[PDB]
Amino acid sequence: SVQAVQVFGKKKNATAVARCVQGKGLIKVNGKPLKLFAPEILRAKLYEPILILGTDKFADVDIRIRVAGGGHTSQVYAVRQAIAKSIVAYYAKYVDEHSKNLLKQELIQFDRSLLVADPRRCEPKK
Amino acid sequence: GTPWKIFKNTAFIKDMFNSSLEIAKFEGAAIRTVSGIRGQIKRALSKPE
Amino acid sequence: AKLKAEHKRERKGALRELRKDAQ
Amino acid sequence: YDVLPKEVLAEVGSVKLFNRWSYDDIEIRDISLTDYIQIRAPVYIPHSAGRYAVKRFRKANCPIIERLTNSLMMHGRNNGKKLMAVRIVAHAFEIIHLMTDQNPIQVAVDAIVNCGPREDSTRRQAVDVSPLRRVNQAIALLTTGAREAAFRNVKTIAECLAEELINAAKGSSNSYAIKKKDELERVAKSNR
Amino acid sequence: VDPDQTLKACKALLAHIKKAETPIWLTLTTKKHIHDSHRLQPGKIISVCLITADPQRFYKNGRVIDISHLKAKFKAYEAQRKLFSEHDVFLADTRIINRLPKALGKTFYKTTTKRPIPVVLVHLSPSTNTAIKVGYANWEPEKLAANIETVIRELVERFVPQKWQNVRNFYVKGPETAALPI
RNA sequence: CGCGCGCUACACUGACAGAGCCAGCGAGUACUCCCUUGGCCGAGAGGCCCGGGUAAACUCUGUCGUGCUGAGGAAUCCCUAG
Numbered sequence: 001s002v003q004a005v006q007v008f009g010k011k012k013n014a015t016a017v018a019r020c021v022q023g024k025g026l027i028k029v030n031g032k033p034l035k036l037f038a039p040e041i042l043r044a045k046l047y048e049p050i051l052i053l054g055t056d057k058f059a060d061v062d063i064r065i066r067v068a069g070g071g072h073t074s075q076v077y078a079v080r081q082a083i084a085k086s087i088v089a090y091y092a093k094y095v096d097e098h099s100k101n102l103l104k105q106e107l108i109q110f111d112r113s114l115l116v117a118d119p120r121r122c123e124p125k126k
Numbered sequence: 127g128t129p130w131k132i133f134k135n136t137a138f139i140k141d142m143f144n145s146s147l148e149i150a151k152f153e154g155a156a157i158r159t160v161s162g163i164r165g166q167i168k169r170a171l172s173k174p175e
Numbered sequence: 176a177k178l179k180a181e182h183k184r185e186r187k188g189a190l191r192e193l194r195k196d197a198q
Numbered sequence: 199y200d201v202l203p204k205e206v207l208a209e210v211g212s213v214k215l216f217n218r219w220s221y222d223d224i225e226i227r228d229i230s231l232t233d234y235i236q237i238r239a240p241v242y243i244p245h246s247a248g249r250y251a252v253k254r255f256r257k258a259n260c261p262i263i264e265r266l267t268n269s270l271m272m273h274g275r276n277n278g279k280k281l282m283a284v285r286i287v288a289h290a291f292e293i294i295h296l297m298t299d300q301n302p303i304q305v306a307v308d309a310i311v312n313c314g315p316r317e318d319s320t321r322r323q324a325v326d327v328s329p330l331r332r333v334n335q336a337i338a339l340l341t342t343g344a345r346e347a348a349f350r351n352v353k354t355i356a357e358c359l360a361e362e363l364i365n366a367a368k369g370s371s372n373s374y375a376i377k378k379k380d381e382l383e384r385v386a387k388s389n390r
Numbered sequence: 391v392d393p394d395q396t397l398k399a400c401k402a403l404l405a406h407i408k409k410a411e412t413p414i415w416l417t418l419t420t421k422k423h424i425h426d427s428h429r430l431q432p433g434k435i436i437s438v439c440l441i442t443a444d445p446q447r448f449y450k451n452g453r454v455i456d457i458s459h460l461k462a463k464f465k466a467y468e469a470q471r472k473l474f475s476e477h478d479v480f481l482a483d484t485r486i487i488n489r490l491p492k493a494l495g496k497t498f499y500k501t502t503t504k505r506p507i508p509v510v511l512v513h514l515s516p517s518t519n520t521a522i523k524v525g526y527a528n529w530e531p532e533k534l535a536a537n538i539e540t541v542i543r544e545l546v547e548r549f550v551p552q553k554w555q556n557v558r559n560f561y562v563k564g565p566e567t568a569a570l571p572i
Numbered sequence: 573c574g575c576g577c578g579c580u581a582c583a584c585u586g587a588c589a590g591a592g593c594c595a596g597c598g599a600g601u602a603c604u605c606c607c608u609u610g611g612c613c614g615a616g617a618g619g620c621c622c623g624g625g626u627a628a629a630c631u632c633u634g635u636c637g638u639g640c641u642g643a644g645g646a647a648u649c650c651c652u653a654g
Contacts, residue, residue, distance in 0.1 A: 001302055011257075012594070012654090013595070014594085014595090025199065025200050026200075026201060027200060027201050033201050033649075034200075034201045035201050035202065035203055035647055037593090037646095038593085038594095038631095039592075039593060039594095039630075039631040040632065041243070041245075041281050041284060041285060041288075041328060041595080041619085041630095041631070041632095042243070042245065042281075042631095043244045043603065044206075044216075044242045045242065045245065047202060047206060047242075047244060048242060050200055050202060051202070051206065051210055052297070055200045055202065055207075055210075057199065058200035065583075067594090068595095069594085069595060069596080070594070070595065070596095071594055071595065071629090071630085072593070072630065073245075073280075073389075073630095074594090074595095075593095075594065077247060084582095111246075113247055120654055122614075123652095123653065125652090127181060130605085131603090131604095131605090132602085132603070134600090146190070147189065147190065147193060150190050150194050150197065151193050151196075151197060152197075153194060153197050154198070174605085174606090175182040184573075214626095249653075249654090250654055251652080252653080274585080275585070276585065278629095279585085279630090281630070281631075282630090285631090288615085326600080349584085350583095350584080350638070350642090351638090352583080352584080352637075352638080354585095355584095355585085390652090412623095415611095415622070415623090417611070417612075417621075417622080419611090419612045419613070419620095419621080421613085425599095434598075450592095459590095459591095461626080463590050465626090465627095501623075501624090502623090503622080503623095515600070515620085517619080517621075518613075519611090519620055519621040519622090520614085520622095521611090521612095521614055521621055521622055541617080558612080558613065559612060559613080561611080561612085563610090563611065563621095563622075564610085564611090564652090565610095565611065565622090565623070566609070566610075566623065566624085567609085567610075568609095568610060568611075569611045569612090569622090570611095571574070
């Protein structure tokens with residue numbers, strides 16, 4: 001009887017789970033907090049969904065991220081995809097349906113790779 | 127001679143020929159393992175002469 | 176000096192003779 | 199806060215590149231180059247996962263700081279290395295803001311406009327140059343000047359990239375890319 | 391264990407050695423030694439790169455390397471040939487002691503017998519023979535005799551089951567020449 | 573001897589030293605690089621003990637400062653998104 005949401009994220013081989021529950025603002029990535037993961041020069045790409053959506057959307061939730069596989073870059077894209085899908089999914093199931101559509105609009109107007117991962121196939125040209 | 131390194135089907139074997147000239151003379155030969163396991167001399171390994 | 180090159184060309188030539196005879 | 203440092207929460211309002219410099223008041227000085235040099239969509243660090251080689255004229259839609267990064271990973275920076283290039287963009291923009299006290303991204307955009315040539319020589323015939331080729335040749339001459347003058351000296355690609363980008367923004371007779379623009383235009387004048 | 395036999399064997403070793411001055415050795419050849427348990431003492435008897443455990447590593451800080459950060463320095467075989475010359479002595483705690491010979495076991499624990507000493511030497515090699523370094527070469531036969539006496543008593547306490555007749559041999563040893571009796 | 577092809581070597585993108593942080597294929601009672609000066613136990617053949625010969629990268633932070641400690645002519649060939 002808790003408000004729990006499981007959510008995935010992807011890149012080349014880095015897969016990340018994120019569980020988002022009713023919390024008090026923390027995001028912890030492999031136990032360590034979010035502002036400590038992913039060596040310094042990419043943490044802006046970690047923070048991109050937070051300072052799109054505003055921290056006021058995040059002050060009621062807790063996001064717990066496990067990341068496996070890939071290199072550093074692919075783990076960063078897997079994390080930020082898991083953040084964005086986590087909050088869109090929590091606002092899908094627990095707060096009203098209008099706010100989901102507004103969050104999808106903000107994330108999609110920025111970059112759709114925060115929600116849908118498009119893995120590259122190859123091009124055998126004609 | 128004695129198996130020196132054992133890969134899956136190949137094997138570097140040793141203590142049998144003295145030189146790459148002798149290997150090259152026998153470089154297509156039917157070699158045999160006393161388990162009843164046939165094999166072929168392929169090529170002289172370079173540095174362990 | 177330049178005797179090792181003679182050793183390598185004579186050695187590899189002898190390997191050519193032994194491999195042609197072998198095949 | 200959710201979890202954010204004091205610098206990011208300190209500048210949480212608009213979009214800042216390297217969390218320091220907004221886009222909202224930077225201006226092109228060529229109506230020809232305006233629709234290709236990208237300041238429209240906001241992006242935080244140049245590293246992004248965009249496919250700008252699917253079909254032509256996508257790289258007129260990727261941001262131009264990512265273009266200065268992507269041009270900064272050439273054979274003088276050992277082609278696989280991306281975060282080296284955004285790090286050199288970081289220290290170069292800091293050296294621009296400390297040498298200049300101007301917005302370094304405006305220094306870079308006015309640098310690119312002031313560097314891309316407008317007439318070239320068909321190998322003789324002299325033709326006007328495309329604006330996409332003007333952006334491309336601009337960025338390539340900028341990073342080429344940064345490496346070719348930061349080759350054997352103690353001065354790093356950060357410092358030399360910042361000097362070619364500042365002098366490029368001035369249009370001075372010191373910058374390598376300005377000198378190559380005037381040499382190509384000089385050849386097109388002499389030939390026609 | 392007579393000191394007349396100890397000093398006489400030490401004088402016969404110094405007389406057998408003739409023409410820098412390398413270290414002498416001592417040897418203990420026990421009998422009926424099925425030593426398959428930890429019954430032998432894997433520790434001490436009588437510039438350090440101190441191997442260590444968890445955050446008494448950072449609370450500790452020659453070079454106090456941790457039991458995680460040793461695996462890179464010894465996994466790199468170019469660097470495993472580096473620490474054998476630069477660092478003079480090694481010393482480990484419990485987990486570093488029980489996990490050192492699976493990492494540095496090629497370039498360190500094989501040839502020089504320069505393995506660690508226990509914290510929070512004598513090594514088994516579980517056949518019936520064993521040996522240890524004696525000491526210096528400018529050392530006196532009474533000094534090396536007393537060191538051989540205390541080391542023989544403590545080593546026989548690690549091999550306690552007879553402690554007087556367990557050794558089918560117990561001799562002194564020259565370093566590189568033909569070794570000696572006792 | 574000739575033509576190549578792989579590989580090594582050659583510096584700012586340095587060197588040193590720490591701290592941090594990431595893969596995917598990989599499981600046949602199977603796998604050991606040498607050959608030895610010596611010594612033990614050896615009637616004899618051998619087994620012993622001691623000496624000789626889970627990533628790179630990347631990030632971040634600090635010490636030195638181009639210092640034989642120099643990236644390859646003509647040519648011809650290839651190559652357009654993981």
